[PDB]
PDB file of C-alpha atoms in Angstrom:
ATOM      1  CA  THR A   1     -30.446   8.811  -5.117  1.00 24.03           C
ATOM      2  CA  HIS A   2     -30.773  11.534  -2.509  1.00 22.01           C
ATOM      3  CA  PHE A   3     -27.824  10.207  -0.501  1.00 23.39           C
ATOM      4  CA  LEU A   4     -25.506  11.533  -3.212  1.00 24.53           C
ATOM      5  CA  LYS A   5     -26.206  15.148  -2.221  1.00 23.82           C
ATOM      6  CA  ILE A   6     -25.630  14.532   1.489  1.00 26.51           C
ATOM      7  CA  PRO A   7     -22.350  15.759   3.044  1.00 29.81           C
ATOM      8  CA  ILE A   8     -20.100  12.786   3.893  1.00 33.74           C
ATOM      9  CA  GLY A   9     -19.770  14.182   7.405  1.00 34.89           C
ATOM     10  CA  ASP A  10     -23.283  12.873   8.161  1.00 32.96           C
ATOM     11  CA  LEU A  11     -23.000   9.614   6.227  1.00 33.93           C
ATOM     12  CA  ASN A  12     -21.200   7.851   9.050  1.00 34.27           C
ATOM     13  CA  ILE A  13     -18.532   6.618   6.623  1.00 35.67           C
ATOM     14  CA  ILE A  14     -15.424   8.635   7.555  1.00 34.97           C
ATOM     15  CA  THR A  15     -13.021   6.834   9.874  1.00 34.73           C
ATOM     16  CA  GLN A  16     -10.243   8.028  12.160  1.00 35.83           C
ATOM     17  CA  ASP A  17      -8.506   4.683  12.730  1.00 36.91           C
ATOM     18  CA  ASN A  18      -5.397   3.355  10.946  1.00 37.14           C
ATOM     19  CA  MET A  19      -4.336   6.585   9.371  1.00 35.36           C
ATOM     20  CA  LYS A  20      -0.874   6.832  10.829  1.00 33.98           C
ATOM     21  CA  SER A  21       1.068   9.642   9.181  1.00 32.22           C
ATOM     22  CA  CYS A  22       4.670  10.486   8.356  1.00 32.87           C
ATOM     23  CA  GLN A  23       6.700  13.644   7.856  1.00 32.97           C
ATOM     24  CA  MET A  24       9.115  15.302   5.459  1.00 33.10           C
ATOM     25  CA  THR A  25      11.881  13.825   7.592  1.00 35.15           C
ATOM     26  CA  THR A  26      10.597  10.284   7.585  1.00 33.26           C
ATOM     27  CA  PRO A  27      12.832   7.750   5.822  1.00 34.59           C
ATOM     28  CA  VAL A  28      11.182   6.003   2.870  1.00 32.88           C
ATOM     29  CA  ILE A  29      12.047   2.569   4.242  1.00 36.12           C
ATOM     30  CA  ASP A  30      10.089   3.432   7.377  1.00 38.19           C
ATOM     31  CA  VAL A  31       7.085   4.519   5.296  1.00 37.69           C
ATOM     32  CA  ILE A  32       7.164   1.272   3.321  1.00 37.55           C
ATOM     33  CA  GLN A  33       6.826  -0.612   6.611  1.00 40.09           C
ATOM     34  CA  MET A  34       3.838   1.593   7.446  1.00 38.62           C
ATOM     35  CA  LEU A  35       2.186   0.773   4.122  1.00 38.41           C
ATOM     36  CA  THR A  36       2.642  -2.993   4.377  1.00 35.89           C
ATOM     37  CA  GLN A  37       1.833  -3.393   8.080  1.00 35.70           C
ATOM     38  CA  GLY A  38      -1.153  -1.075   7.839  1.00 32.94           C
ATOM     39  CA  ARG A  39      -2.769  -2.544   4.718  1.00 34.54           C
ATOM     40  CA  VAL A  40      -2.682   0.890   3.075  1.00 33.04           C
ATOM     41  CA  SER A  41      -1.371   2.092  -0.279  1.00 34.22           C
ATOM     42  CA  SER A  42      -0.668   5.669   0.806  1.00 31.16           C
ATOM     43  CA  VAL A  43       0.377   7.558   3.926  1.00 30.60           C
ATOM     44  CA  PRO A  44      -0.434  11.213   4.685  1.00 28.78           C
ATOM     45  CA  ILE A  45       2.453  13.655   5.147  1.00 32.33           C
ATOM     46  CA  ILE A  46       1.817  16.378   7.718  1.00 32.65           C
ATOM     47  CA  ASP A  47       3.851  18.954   9.638  1.00 32.30           C
ATOM     48  CA  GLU A  48       4.278  19.353  13.410  1.00 35.10           C
ATOM     49  CA  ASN A  49       0.916  21.123  13.787  1.00 36.86           C
ATOM     50  CA  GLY A  50      -1.110  18.601  11.807  1.00 40.08           C
ATOM     51  CA  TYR A  51      -1.404  20.303   8.424  1.00 38.44           C
ATOM     52  CA  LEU A  52      -1.585  17.918   5.479  1.00 38.53           C
ATOM     53  CA  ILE A  53       1.107  18.912   2.981  1.00 37.02           C
ATOM     54  CA  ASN A  54       0.947  15.849   0.711  1.00 35.01           C
ATOM     55  CA  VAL A  55       0.971  12.046   0.613  1.00 34.90           C
ATOM     56  CA  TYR A  56       3.425   9.232  -0.080  1.00 30.64           C
ATOM     57  CA  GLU A  57       2.039   6.330  -2.129  1.00 27.85           C
ATOM     58  CA  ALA A  58       3.207   2.797  -2.776  1.00 28.13           C
ATOM     59  CA  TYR A  59       3.383   3.907  -6.437  1.00 31.62           C
ATOM     60  CA  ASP A  60       6.037   6.515  -5.582  1.00 31.59           C
ATOM     61  CA  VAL A  61       8.203   3.712  -4.171  1.00 32.03           C
ATOM     62  CA  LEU A  62       7.992   1.857  -7.496  1.00 35.47           C
ATOM     63  CA  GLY A  63       9.101   4.978  -9.337  1.00 32.06           C
ATOM     64  CA  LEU A  64      11.831   5.628  -6.800  1.00 31.51           C
ATOM     65  CA  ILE A  65      13.624   2.341  -7.509  1.00 29.85           C
ATOM     66  CA  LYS A  66      13.203   2.761 -11.266  1.00 31.58           C
ATOM     67  CA  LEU A  67      16.061   3.337   1.055  1.00 32.08           C
ATOM     68  CA  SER A  68      17.091   5.599   3.950  1.00 31.80           C
ATOM     69  CA  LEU A  69      16.413   8.908   2.167  1.00 31.86           C
ATOM     70  CA  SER A  70      13.505  10.869   3.625  1.00 30.47           C
ATOM     71  CA  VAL A  71      10.105  11.200   1.983  1.00 29.38           C
ATOM     72  CA  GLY A  72      10.939  14.806   1.150  1.00 29.42           C
ATOM     73  CA  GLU A  73      14.001  13.826  -0.863  1.00 30.83           C
ATOM     74  CA  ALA A  74      12.175  10.931  -2.531  1.00 35.39           C
ATOM     75  CA  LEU A  75       9.605  13.351  -3.980  1.00 37.48           C
ATOM     76  CA  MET A  76      12.174  16.102  -4.733  1.00 37.60           C
ATOM     77  CA  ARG A  77      11.370  16.572  -8.440  1.00 33.01           C
ATOM     78  CA  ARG A  78       8.955  13.867  -9.645  1.00 30.71           C
ATOM     79  CA  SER A  79       5.799  14.247 -11.776  1.00 30.34           C
ATOM     80  CA  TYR A  80      -6.340  13.322  -2.551  1.00 31.66           C
ATOM     81  CA  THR A  81      -8.373  15.400  -0.054  1.00 32.05           C
ATOM     82  CA  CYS A  82     -11.852  16.634   0.894  1.00 33.68           C
ATOM     83  CA  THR A  83     -13.826  18.031   3.839  1.00 31.42           C
ATOM     84  CA  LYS A  84     -16.708  16.576   5.818  1.00 32.46           C
ATOM     85  CA  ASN A  85     -18.885  19.084   3.944  1.00 30.30           C
ATOM     86  CA  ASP A  86     -18.312  17.665   0.451  1.00 30.98           C
ATOM     87  CA  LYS A  87     -21.052  15.634  -1.227  1.00 31.84           C
ATOM     88  CA  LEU A  88     -20.525  11.937  -1.860  1.00 30.16           C
ATOM     89  CA  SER A  89     -21.353  12.491  -5.534  1.00 31.16           C
ATOM     90  CA  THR A  90     -18.366  14.745  -6.224  1.00 31.23           C
ATOM     91  CA  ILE A  91     -16.121  12.602  -4.023  1.00 32.43           C
ATOM     92  CA  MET A  92     -16.926   9.356  -5.837  1.00 32.39           C
ATOM     93  CA  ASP A  93     -16.078  11.143  -9.067  1.00 31.24           C
ATOM     94  CA  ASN A  94     -12.748  12.463  -7.840  1.00 30.88           C
ATOM     95  CA  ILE A  95     -11.906   9.005  -6.508  1.00 31.24           C
ATOM     96  CA  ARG A  96     -12.446   7.513  -9.969  1.00 33.73           C
ATOM     97  CA  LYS A  97     -10.399  10.189 -11.741  1.00 31.58           C
ATOM     98  CA  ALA A  98      -7.454  10.049  -9.334  1.00 31.81           C
ATOM     99  CA  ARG A  99      -7.771   6.284  -8.800  1.00 29.70           C
ATOM    100  CA  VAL A 100      -6.837   6.301  -5.115  1.00 27.47           C
ATOM    101  CA  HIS A 101      -8.138   4.097  -2.307  1.00 29.37           C
ATOM    102  CA  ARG A 102      -8.116   6.755   0.406  1.00 29.10           C
ATOM    103  CA  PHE A 103      -9.334  10.342   0.518  1.00 27.11           C
ATOM    104  CA  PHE A 104      -7.936  12.189   3.495  1.00 25.99           C
ATOM    105  CA  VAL A 105     -10.342  14.522   5.255  1.00 27.25           C
ATOM    106  CA  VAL A 106      -9.025  17.907   6.362  1.00 30.11           C
ATOM    107  CA  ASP A 107     -10.675  20.647   8.409  1.00 26.37           C
ATOM    108  CA  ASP A 108     -11.225  24.230   7.260  1.00 27.22           C
ATOM    109  CA  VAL A 109      -7.543  25.110   7.798  1.00 26.76           C
ATOM    110  CA  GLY A 110      -6.034  22.045   6.148  1.00 26.28           C
ATOM    111  CA  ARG A 111      -5.419  19.863   9.187  1.00 28.40           C
ATOM    112  CA  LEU A 112      -5.895  16.110   8.864  1.00 28.56           C
ATOM    113  CA  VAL A 113      -9.062  15.079  10.711  1.00 30.05           C
ATOM    114  CA  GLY A 114      -9.857  11.678   9.200  1.00 29.52           C
ATOM    115  CA  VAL A 115      -9.960   9.419   6.164  1.00 30.00           C
ATOM    116  CA  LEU A 116     -12.564   8.172   3.681  1.00 28.85           C
ATOM    117  CA  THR A 117     -11.668   4.789   2.177  1.00 32.08           C
ATOM    118  CA  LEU A 118     -13.026   3.245  -1.001  1.00 29.99           C
ATOM    119  CA  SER A 119     -13.788   0.126   1.050  1.00 31.80           C
ATOM    120  CA  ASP A 120     -16.138   2.037   3.386  1.00 32.21           C
ATOM    121  CA  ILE A 121     -17.882   3.678   0.417  1.00 33.47           C
ATOM    122  CA  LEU A 122     -18.521   0.220  -1.057  1.00 36.81           C
ATOM    123  CA  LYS A 123     -19.868  -1.070   2.299  1.00 36.52           C
ATOM    124  CA  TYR A 124     -22.109   1.975   2.457  1.00 36.41           C
ATOM    125  CA  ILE A 125     -23.372   0.997  -0.993  1.00 32.76           C
ATOM    126  CA  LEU A 126     -23.667  -2.681  -0.028  1.00 32.24           C
ATOM    127  CA  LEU A 127     -25.900  -1.813   2.938  1.00 31.54           C
ATOM    128  CA  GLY A 128     -27.567   0.486   0.417  1.00 32.16           C
ATOM    129  CA  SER A 129     -29.353  -2.766  -0.446  1.00 32.75           C
ATOM    130  CA  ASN A 130     -31.774  -3.979   2.241  1.00 32.88           C
TER     131      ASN A 130
ATOM    132  CA  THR B   1      19.542  -3.363  -9.983  1.00 30.44           C
ATOM    133  CA  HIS B   2      19.628  -6.902 -11.379  1.00 27.92           C
ATOM    134  CA  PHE B   3      16.419  -8.059  -9.671  1.00 32.54           C
ATOM    135  CA  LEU B   4      14.498  -5.770 -12.025  1.00 31.05           C
ATOM    136  CA  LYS B   5      15.267  -8.094 -14.933  1.00 30.43           C
ATOM    137  CA  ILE B   6      14.226 -11.279 -13.161  1.00 26.69           C
ATOM    138  CA  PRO B   7      10.928 -12.951 -14.214  1.00 31.96           C
ATOM    139  CA  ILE B   8       8.327 -12.583 -11.438  1.00 30.90           C
ATOM    140  CA  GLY B   9       7.775 -16.325 -11.578  1.00 32.51           C
ATOM    141  CA  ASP B  10      11.156 -16.707  -9.878  1.00 32.59           C
ATOM    142  CA  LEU B  11      10.810 -13.843  -7.392  1.00 30.02           C
ATOM    143  CA  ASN B  12       8.587 -15.752  -4.968  1.00 28.03           C
ATOM    144  CA  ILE B  13       6.103 -12.857  -4.944  1.00 28.17           C
ATOM    145  CA  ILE B  14       3.082 -14.253  -6.801  1.00 35.14           C
ATOM    146  CA  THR B  15       0.291 -15.640  -4.590  1.00 36.51           C
ATOM    147  CA  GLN B  16      -2.746 -17.873  -5.071  1.00 34.02           C
ATOM    148  CA  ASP B  17      -4.519 -16.948  -1.852  1.00 36.61           C
ATOM    149  CA  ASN B  18      -7.329 -14.365  -1.801  1.00 40.31           C
ATOM    150  CA  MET B  19      -8.444 -14.391  -5.433  1.00 39.69           C
ATOM    151  CA  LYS B  20     -12.100 -15.387  -5.609  1.00 44.75           C
ATOM    152  CA  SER B  21     -13.524 -14.776  -9.071  1.00 46.72           C
ATOM    153  CA  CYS B  22     -16.870 -14.001 -10.651  1.00 47.00           C
ATOM    154  CA  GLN B  23     -18.542 -14.329 -14.050  1.00 47.52           C
ATOM    155  CA  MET B  24     -20.318 -12.239 -16.677  1.00 47.00           C
ATOM    156  CA  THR B  25     -23.646 -13.219 -15.141  1.00 44.55           C
ATOM    157  CA  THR B  26     -22.625 -12.379 -11.571  1.00 47.36           C
ATOM    158  CA  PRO B  27     -24.842  -9.560 -10.226  1.00 44.20           C
ATOM    159  CA  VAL B  28     -22.788  -6.478  -9.390  1.00 44.38           C
ATOM    160  CA  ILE B  29     -24.294  -6.455  -5.906  1.00 45.76           C
ATOM    161  CA  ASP B  30     -22.619  -9.838  -5.353  1.00 43.99           C
ATOM    162  CA  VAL B  31     -19.323  -8.497  -6.701  1.00 42.20           C
ATOM    163  CA  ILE B  32     -19.434  -5.614  -4.220  1.00 39.55           C
ATOM    164  CA  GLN B  33     -19.610  -8.157  -1.413  1.00 39.72           C
ATOM    165  CA  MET B  34     -16.557  -9.974  -2.769  1.00 40.90           C
ATOM    166  CA  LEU B  35     -14.566  -6.729  -2.955  1.00 40.82           C
ATOM    167  CA  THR B  36     -15.443  -5.748   0.621  1.00 42.35           C
ATOM    168  CA  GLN B  37     -15.150  -9.182   2.249  1.00 44.54           C
ATOM    169  CA  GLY B  38     -11.933  -9.959   0.381  1.00 45.83           C
ATOM    170  CA  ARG B  39     -10.617  -6.488   1.118  1.00 46.28           C
ATOM    171  CA  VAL B  40      -9.666  -6.161  -2.587  1.00 47.85           C
ATOM    172  CA  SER B  41     -10.392  -3.432  -5.157  1.00 49.63           C
ATOM    173  CA  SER B  42     -10.940  -5.580  -8.229  1.00 50.77           C
ATOM    174  CA  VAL B  43     -12.226  -9.025  -9.096  1.00 54.05           C
ATOM    175  CA  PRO B  44     -11.136 -11.237 -12.008  1.00 54.42           C
ATOM    176  CA  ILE B  45     -13.915 -12.241 -14.421  1.00 56.38           C
ATOM    177  CA  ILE B  46     -13.421 -15.837 -15.601  1.00 56.42           C
ATOM    178  CA  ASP B  47     -15.601 -18.221 -17.619  1.00 56.65           C
ATOM    179  CA  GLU B  48     -16.785 -21.812 -17.167  1.00 56.90           C
ATOM    180  CA  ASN B  49     -13.378 -23.096 -18.315  1.00 58.09           C
ATOM    181  CA  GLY B  50     -11.083 -20.832 -16.325  1.00 58.13           C
ATOM    182  CA  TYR B  51     -10.195 -18.297 -19.009  1.00 58.08           C
ATOM    183  CA  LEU B  52      -9.722 -14.763 -17.749  1.00 59.27           C
ATOM    184  CA  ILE B  53     -12.310 -12.652 -19.572  1.00 59.06           C
ATOM    185  CA  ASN B  54     -12.014  -9.252 -17.900  1.00 57.85           C
ATOM    186  CA  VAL B  55     -11.729  -7.500 -14.531  1.00 58.98           C
ATOM    187  CA  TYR B  56     -14.319  -5.505 -12.609  1.00 58.57           C
ATOM    188  CA  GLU B  57     -13.159  -2.687 -10.324  1.00 58.84           C
ATOM    189  CA  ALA B  58     -14.585  -0.805  -7.346  1.00 61.50           C
ATOM    190  CA  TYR B  59     -14.143   2.314  -9.506  1.00 61.62           C
ATOM    191  CA  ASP B  60     -16.620   0.764 -11.947  1.00 64.01           C
ATOM    192  CA  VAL B  61     -19.169   0.491  -9.157  1.00 67.41           C
ATOM    193  CA  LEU B  62     -18.751   4.182  -8.377  1.00 64.52           C
ATOM    194  CA  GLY B  63     -19.482   4.844 -12.039  1.00 66.03           C
ATOM    195  CA  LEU B  64     -22.842   3.061 -12.117  1.00 68.32           C
ATOM    196  CA  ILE B  65     -24.030   5.319  -9.294  1.00 68.38           C
ATOM    197  CA  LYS B  66     -23.686   8.561 -11.268  1.00 69.57           C
ATOM    198  CA  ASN B  67     -30.691   2.590  -9.968  1.00 70.69           C
ATOM    199  CA  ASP B  68     -30.661  -1.156  -9.065  1.00 70.42           C
ATOM    200  CA  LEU B  69     -27.436  -3.168  -8.693  1.00 71.11           C
ATOM    201  CA  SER B  70     -28.871  -6.588  -9.579  1.00 69.84           C
ATOM    202  CA  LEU B  71     -27.621  -6.180 -13.151  1.00 70.21           C
ATOM    203  CA  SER B  72     -24.964  -8.658 -14.280  1.00 68.09           C
ATOM    204  CA  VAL B  73     -21.260  -7.868 -14.582  1.00 68.96           C
ATOM    205  CA  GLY B  74     -21.624  -8.300 -18.328  1.00 69.40           C
ATOM    206  CA  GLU B  75     -24.206  -5.520 -18.562  1.00 65.22           C
ATOM    207  CA  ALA B  76     -22.250  -3.271 -16.211  1.00 66.12           C
ATOM    208  CA  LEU B  77     -19.130  -3.556 -18.388  1.00 68.44           C
ATOM    209  CA  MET B  78     -21.209  -1.986 -21.157  1.00 68.15           C
ATOM    210  CA  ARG B  79     -21.452   1.200 -19.110  1.00 67.08           C
ATOM    211  CA  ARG B  80     -17.768   1.981 -18.711  1.00 70.98           C
ATOM    212  CA  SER B  81     -16.033   4.141 -21.327  1.00 68.64           C
ATOM    213  CA  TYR B  82      -4.640  -6.196 -15.038  1.00 69.05           C
ATOM    214  CA  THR B  83      -2.768  -9.161 -16.547  1.00 66.48           C
ATOM    215  CA  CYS B  84       0.718 -10.661 -16.860  1.00 71.27           C
ATOM    216  CA  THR B  85       2.554 -13.996 -16.979  1.00 69.70           C
ATOM    217  CA  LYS B  86       5.198 -15.547 -14.746  1.00 68.70           C
ATOM    218  CA  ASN B  87       7.713 -14.725 -17.478  1.00 66.50           C
ATOM    219  CA  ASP B  88       7.350 -10.944 -17.340  1.00 63.62           C
ATOM    220  CA  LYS B  89      10.197  -8.970 -15.848  1.00 63.41           C
ATOM    221  CA  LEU B  90       9.615  -7.164 -12.555  1.00 63.36           C
ATOM    222  CA  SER B  91      10.666  -3.851 -14.117  1.00 63.33           C
ATOM    223  CA  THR B  92       7.977  -4.062 -16.783  1.00 64.29           C
ATOM    224  CA  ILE B  93       5.328  -4.981 -14.222  1.00 64.48           C
ATOM    225  CA  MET B  94       6.210  -2.210 -11.776  1.00 63.20           C
ATOM    226  CA  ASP B  95       5.948   0.363 -14.573  1.00 61.33           C
ATOM    227  CA  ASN B  96       2.548  -0.924 -15.677  1.00 58.49           C
ATOM    228  CA  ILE B  97       1.323  -0.936 -12.076  1.00 57.03           C
ATOM    229  CA  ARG B  98       2.447   2.691 -11.754  1.00 58.94           C
ATOM    230  CA  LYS B  99       0.873   3.816 -15.025  1.00 56.52           C
ATOM    231  CA  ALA B 100      -2.426   1.959 -14.658  1.00 53.97           C
ATOM    232  CA  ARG B 101      -2.678   2.563 -10.909  1.00 55.58           C
ATOM    233  CA  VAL B 102      -3.952  -0.870  -9.860  1.00 60.89           C
ATOM    234  CA  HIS B 103      -3.177  -2.874  -6.738  1.00 59.06           C
ATOM    235  CA  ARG B 104      -3.384  -6.343  -8.229  1.00 56.23           C
ATOM    236  CA  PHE B 105      -2.149  -7.897 -11.450  1.00 54.09           C
ATOM    237  CA  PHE B 106      -3.768 -11.203 -12.396  1.00 55.71           C
ATOM    238  CA  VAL B 107      -1.415 -13.920 -13.585  1.00 52.09           C
ATOM    239  CA  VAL B 108      -2.435 -16.183 -16.436  1.00 51.80           C
ATOM    240  CA  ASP B 109      -0.721 -19.217 -17.966  1.00 50.49           C
ATOM    241  CA  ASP B 110       0.041 -19.680 -21.672  1.00 48.93           C
ATOM    242  CA  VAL B 111      -3.539 -20.702 -22.469  1.00 47.99           C
ATOM    243  CA  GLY B 112      -5.058 -17.609 -20.846  1.00 48.57           C
ATOM    244  CA  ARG B 113      -6.243 -19.179 -17.609  1.00 54.05           C
ATOM    245  CA  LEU B 114      -5.968 -17.483 -14.226  1.00 54.38           C
ATOM    246  CA  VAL B 115      -3.252 -19.136 -12.122  1.00 56.10           C
ATOM    247  CA  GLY B 116      -2.504 -16.473  -9.524  1.00 54.64           C
ATOM    248  CA  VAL B 117      -2.168 -12.800  -8.676  1.00 58.07           C
ATOM    249  CA  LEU B 118       0.558 -10.242  -7.935  1.00 59.37           C
ATOM    250  CA  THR B 119      -0.310  -7.579  -5.383  1.00 59.02           C
ATOM    251  CA  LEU B 120       1.309  -4.187  -4.925  1.00 60.10           C
ATOM    252  CA  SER B 121       1.503  -5.039  -1.223  1.00 57.72           C
ATOM    253  CA  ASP B 122       3.706  -8.066  -1.936  1.00 57.13           C
ATOM    254  CA  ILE B 123       5.914  -6.038  -4.295  1.00 58.10           C
ATOM    255  CA  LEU B 124       6.475  -3.604  -1.410  1.00 59.84           C
ATOM    256  CA  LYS B 125       7.315  -6.425   1.017  1.00 61.11           C
ATOM    257  CA  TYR B 126       9.758  -7.764  -1.539  1.00 54.73           C
ATOM    258  CA  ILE B 127      11.367  -4.295  -1.656  1.00 53.62           C
ATOM    259  CA  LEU B 128      11.289  -3.951   2.138  1.00 54.86           C
ATOM    260  CA  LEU B 129      13.261  -7.174   2.518  1.00 51.99           C
ATOM    261  CA  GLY B 130      15.878  -5.256   0.553  1.00 51.86           C
ATOM    262  CA  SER B 131      17.119  -4.259   4.011  1.00 49.40           C
ATOM    263  CA  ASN B 132      19.653  -7.115   4.056  1.00 50.07           C
TER     264      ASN B 132
END
């Protein structure tokens, strides 16, 4: 019950592997390949310096086709994140509301530092047994 | 634009692989193991005769924890405030996936029994192959 108030940065649950990113100039078709090959349902979109500006989700692709155009153009006019300091309690709530499988972790300036997956939260809970 | 009107049962996208199920009496703690080991975010709840009863999600688990996770799936369902057939058109299914935000759609036959599943991942691969 006390683990809920502990900052995720100390919960040994954030990972920095398999979080390949894309850019405003990345073709959608290329991002689809990233989603399928990487077993992920969303890819982070950052700039040249590493700042997280948004994300491209498998859902967006479904809306897109009711190809080669970049991610920027694909999101043109159509209808998330946390820091290592946030508490697991508020994060689990935001995950439920937004219904996403990955919460990207950004530093104090907005740069992508890691990712917190729903899978790792569940495993944390599973071990919560014992 | 014509593939959107084709029934998924003819799109060679439905699978019968990783789809282990559970029951109303299955302890949530056991369900959590299925989600993690199967690398899935939801598990189909079926009964003794194969009928699809409901679906339990990882999001549901997060709900129970604002306490003991040995409680059955049945009881857990009480604390929370999906499906299709091989005849449904791809267009209808992609819209429902988008609106409900799920990664898997369980496929049932005409009698309501689970016969397979349709993952978002496979829909994407189907789209990707659109590079012909």
